[PDB]
Design a binder for this molecule. Structure first.
Ligand SMILES: OC[C@H]1O[C@@H](O[C@H]2[C@H](O)[C@@H](O)[C@H](O)O[C@@H]2CO)[C@H](O)[C@@H](O)[C@@H]1O
Ligand code: CA
Ligand code: CA
Ligand code: CA
Ligand code: CA
Ligand code: CA
Length: 302
């Protein structure tokens, strides 16, 4: 119903809008590394998320490094499975080229261009697809001006060759926090969004003001990843500050994907160790994080 209702997404004055030009806010889950927790990504779990949680977007996090796509490109089959399930279930899907320890997106540029050429040729005609070309650029020597913008200026045309209009999300500096730098030197492609990522246990008002600065420059922002834990992963979850972030995003209608759908024993994980990979979870199978996120998505679902 989601995609059938909104169809082709586009950006209008920094806002994500549907084919009728009305505002659209996507809320959903991100998988964790597909090379580690790919079993949680399948038609049945995605359907359960759609039907029981109300998600309208699913994020496929395909690490490049850490035993990911660069060493074992077969993980790409798992990306296709998710994309096809999203098309079948009528929801949106983010193909995330998940850089992290490979902190400069230019490390695997050639591979990135080949991967997105293949994905855009396969799925470029479906409105469900959203491309995320560089999860989290990071490190003091990786900046918008010298490394990220040029990277995007080379990858975008590869995608645009096959898919002229689907949304493309571009990572920003300092683990996708430096949206203000990107907002002061924006890409020309009309259908682009800058990624902003945060941890509720760590980030607060200063980063919210930064996001507002970027929004005030006409930039579109997609919170393609955010956790309820502290970046340190200590102290549990911080649902009080998480709720402050939820409200802030609702005011600005920002779309988001929560990190992450896995049973790993870490505070940000939505499931408890042992949870069923195909969904149909009981309340006891969800973590405090998963319980809160599920409620945030349900409470605004139609
Ligand atoms: O268990 C898988 C893999 O996880 C790595 O840590 C993750 C963390 O679990 C996640 O919440 C965060 O977004 O990213 C980090 C980095 O990928 C861990 O470093 C690996 O040893 C481990 O094999
Ligand atoms: Ca099957
Ligand atoms: Ca081609
Ligand atoms: Ca298209
Ligand atoms: Ca170049
Ligand atoms: Ca992160």
């Amino acid at each position: 119903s989601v995609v059938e209702e909104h169809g082709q997404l586009s950006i209008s004055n920094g806002e994500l809008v549907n084919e009728r030009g009305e505002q659209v806010q996507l809320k959903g889950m991100s998988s964790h590394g597909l090379q580690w927790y790919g079993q949680f990504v399948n038609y049945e779990s995605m359907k359960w998320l759609r039907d029981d949680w109300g998600i309208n977007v699913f994020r496929a996090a395909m690490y490049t490094s850490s035993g990911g796509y660069i060493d074992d490109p077969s993980v790409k089959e798992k990306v296709k499975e998710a994309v096809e399930a999203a098309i079948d279930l009528d929801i949106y899907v983010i193909i995330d080229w998940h850089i992290l320890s490979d902190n400069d997106p230019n490390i695997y540029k050639e591979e990135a261009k080949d991967f997105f050429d293949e994905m855009s040729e396969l799925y470029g005609d479906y409105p469900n697809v959203i491309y995320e070309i560089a999860n989290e650029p990071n490190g003091s020597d990786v900046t918008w001006g010298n490394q990220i913008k040029p990277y995007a200026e080379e990858v975008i045309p590869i995608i645009r060759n096959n898919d002229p209009n689907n949304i493309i999300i571009v990572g920003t500096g300092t683990w996708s926090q430096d949206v203000h730098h990107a907002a002061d030197n924006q890409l020309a492609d009309p259908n682009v969004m800058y990624a902003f990522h945060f941890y509720a246990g760590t980030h607060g008002q200063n980063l919210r003001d930064q996001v507002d600065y970027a929004l005030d420059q006409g930039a579109a922002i997609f919170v393609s990843e955010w956790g309820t834990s502290a970046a340190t992963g200590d102290g549990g979850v911080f649902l009080d500050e998480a709720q402050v972030w939820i409200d802030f995003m609702d005011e600005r209608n920002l779309s988001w994907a929560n990190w992450s759908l896995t049973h790993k024993d870490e505070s940000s994980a939505a499931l408890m160790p042992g949870a069923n990979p195909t969904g149909g979870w009981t309340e006891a199978e969800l973590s405090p994080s998963g319980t809160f996120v599920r409620e945030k998505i349900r409470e605004s679902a139609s």
